[PDB]
Write a protein that binds this DNA or RNA. Structure first.
Ligand SMILES: Nc1ncnc2c1ncn2[C@@H]1O[C@H](COP(=O)(O)OP(=O)(O)NP(=O)(O)O)[C@@H](O)[C@H]1O
Ligand SMILES: [Mg+2]
Length: 89
DNA sequence: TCTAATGCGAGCATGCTCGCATTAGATTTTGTTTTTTTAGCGGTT
């Protein structure tokens, strides 16, 4: 199923998501994986914010991913990481 | 580097221009023209 959360800048979408994930961490710390997919220059920020709960003070079930990092983990599981890769140069 | 002043003598109409040579001075730039894209690390050695 899909959910389109839409609103102008300042709507509170990101905090709404942060809080959603936090509550879902409260309910079941070992539940099914929760993937937070953000731009690469936004991975750390969210990681910090999720970690800022007096309740839990961290995350385990839920990770923050870039497209690249997500590719790294899923490929670590599924395979195909053997081949070397080429920098742009 | 070219323009101007200084000196001297020959031809002309004893004093005057003119030729020539030469040096010495001073006098002196302006201008303008771009952006290049494209998604932070890495826990474990
Ligand atoms: N319920 C709330 N009440 C007051 N301030 C809030 C609330 N939720 C979030 N904020 C603040 O609002 C600011 C922006 O929240 P955010 O979650 O980024 O909204 P947003 O929809 O993502 N805006 P944007 O990312 O620019 O499109 C932050 O400074 C939050 O601390
Ligand atoms: Mg936001």
């Amino acid at each position: 199923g899909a959910e389109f959360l839409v609103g102008r800048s300042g709507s509170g979408k990101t905090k709404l998501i942060i809080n959603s994930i936090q509550d879902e961490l409260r309910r079941a710390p070992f539940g099914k994986p929760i993937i937070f997919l953000v731009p690469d220059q936004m991975t750390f920020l969210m990681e910090y914010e999720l970690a800022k709960t007096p309740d839990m003070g961290g995350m385990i079930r839920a990770q923050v991913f870039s497209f690249s990092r997500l590719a790294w983990r899923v490929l670590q599981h599924t395979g195909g990481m053997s081949r070397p890769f080429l920098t742009s140069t």
